[PDB]
Design a binder for this molecule. Sequence first.
Ligand SMILES: CCCCCCCCCCCCO[C@@H]1O[C@H](CO)[C@@H](O[C@H]2O[C@H](CO)[C@@H](O)[C@H](O)[C@H]2O)[C@H](O)[C@H]1O
Ligand SMILES: CCCCCCCCCCCCO[C@@H]1O[C@H](CO)[C@@H](O[C@H]2O[C@H](CO)[C@@H](O)[C@H](O)[C@H]2O)[C@H](O)[C@H]1O
Ligand SMILES: CCCCCCCCCCCCO[C@@H]1O[C@H](CO)[C@@H](O[C@H]2O[C@H](CO)[C@@H](O)[C@H](O)[C@H]2O)[C@H](O)[C@H]1O
Lengths: 189, 87, 75, 40, 101
Amino acid sequence: SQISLLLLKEIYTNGSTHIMLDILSVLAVISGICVIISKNPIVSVLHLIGLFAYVSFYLILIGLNFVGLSYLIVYIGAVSILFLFILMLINIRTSELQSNTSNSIPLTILVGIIISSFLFKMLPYGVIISKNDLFFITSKIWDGALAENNHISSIGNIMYTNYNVWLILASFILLLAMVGAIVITIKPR
Amino acid sequence: NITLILFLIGILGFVLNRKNIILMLISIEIMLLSITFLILLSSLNMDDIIGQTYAIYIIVVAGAESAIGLGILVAFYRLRGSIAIEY
Amino acid sequence: LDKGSIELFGPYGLERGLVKLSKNISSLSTSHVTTYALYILVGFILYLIYNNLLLDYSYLLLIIILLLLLMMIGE
Amino acid sequence: YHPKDAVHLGLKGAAVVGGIGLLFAAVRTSLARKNVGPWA
Amino acid sequence: MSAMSIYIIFVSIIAILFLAIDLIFAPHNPYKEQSRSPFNISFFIYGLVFLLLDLEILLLYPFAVSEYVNSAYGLAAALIFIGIITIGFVYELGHDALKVH
Ligand SMILES: CCCCCCCCCCCCO[C@@H]1O[C@H](CO)[C@@H](O[C@H]2O[C@H](CO)[C@@H](O)[C@H](O)[C@H]2O)[C@H](O)[C@H]1O
Ligand SMILES: CCCCCCCCCCCCO[C@@H]1O[C@H](CO)[C@@H](O[C@H]2O[C@H](CO)[C@@H](O)[C@H](O)[C@H]2O)[C@H](O)[C@H]1O
Ligand SMILES: CCCCCCCCCCCCO[C@@H]1O[C@H](CO)[C@@H](O[C@H]2O[C@H](CO)[C@@H](O)[C@H](O)[C@H]2O)[C@H](O)[C@H]1O
């Protein structure tokens, strides 16, 4: 007789809010422009450190803990530090890096409209899934929960066996970045 | 939609750059982040751990190009004394 | 005719026309990475427009002939 | 055969080709070596 | 709310209060009143070798939390991955790339 479908608020297993994602995306965009507009290369790299952390938090907030932490350990921990070293040591005159951005403003409207209007259609439905609105329903399973693994354990289960050729080719890429970078920079002996 | 916006930002970094060769290093990395973030969000949508693995290898190659690139920039600076383009 | 228009509407006019054209295109190459990067994006967008707007192939050839004759004019 | 509205198609030709040239003009503005501004 | 969220806010609030004491109470005064030299290549090398070894050690962390399944086949591949990265380390040790000796 009364509505068979009933909607209730969860109390102790209530997850997180979708709003935090609109906040983090807005922050990621705002710092993104500030990267490409800042006069000082130092400030641009700092705004890049800010952007890498907004994306890392978005990933951790959607359950991708190991990759988000990996991004934080590699991009902010090591890649951007190497960027601060080179920037805080090279003689940079800020007037010589500034160009008349207004001359380039018309091509910015053109390129932004065309590229966005093409790439958007290419994406899959689940990336652009977000007045009646769809809701995503989830339920529980038992046979597929016997020994659930964290994502790192799942990546580990296949990273060194089934797809081990990728590890071999990446190890040689890192090996090349080691030998090649030292050969081009240091004075032998 | 966030992944496409950041891909534009890296692209517009090349649109708005006449002097910074540092900012072209930065704009390449913003483009790599957008593409990895797209693969990562589509991976959660298809229950596929192989997307997470491909994201990891893109982060390793991305750092390796940063090392190879900033090393070449150091070789260039030693003889030129400026990283500025005479425009 | 022989020492006139046959050489003007022929080898000598193709020589002086093409040498002028080739100097203009060769002056687009300033060895600036910033300006070369802009060219790659430009050439990227033109490929995207052509293979997504289903434009008549003839519209492309008009573009090439326009572009080539624009480098035929100096200054 | 089916007649074609020549004037209607003519505007399409002008806009498509003239749009590309407008994109070419934009590269000229971006590559300009002086403070010509956006309205150049 | 989650403990992690309330924890980050509380740490954030304490930082604000310690800052406020300085602005509120500490004395204030309105008066707030060019060379070139080469930098050592060593600074570049420290970040370079850190970045590469940090990535390689990172790629080994999944193996440690999946050893029961990787087993002998996984051990072998992880040892081949260790050996390639070690050979690169012996190269920086061999050329004193760190320029420390
Ligand atoms: C029996 C005839 C057989 C002909 C066979 C085919 C011959 C080749 C055909 C094309 C020949 C090139 O033709 C020639 O092109 C160039 C274009 O820059 C022009 O060459 C000239 O243009 C104008 C003159 O109008 C000059 O100011 C300019 O200095 C010069 O470039 C000539 O106007 C044209 O005569
Ligand atoms: C971070 C969270 C947000 C901030 C929260 C706290 C905000 C506090 C704001 C009020 C701070 C008041 O602090 C007070 O400032 C005034 C004005 O500069 C200082 O005044 C000082 O500079 C003025 C300049 O005109 C002089 O005339 C005066 O003689 C001198 O003492 C006080 O020495 C300082 O104690
Ligand atoms: C699993 C761990 C395995 C550890 C393996 C250890 C690496 C063994 C091979 C590398 C060491 C041998 O390689 C050796 O390195 C030393 C230290 O830089 C170098 O040492 C010599 O050159 C450098 C550079 O001019 C000088 O600063 C140093 O004072 C001098 O003794 C030798 O020229 C090189 O032949």
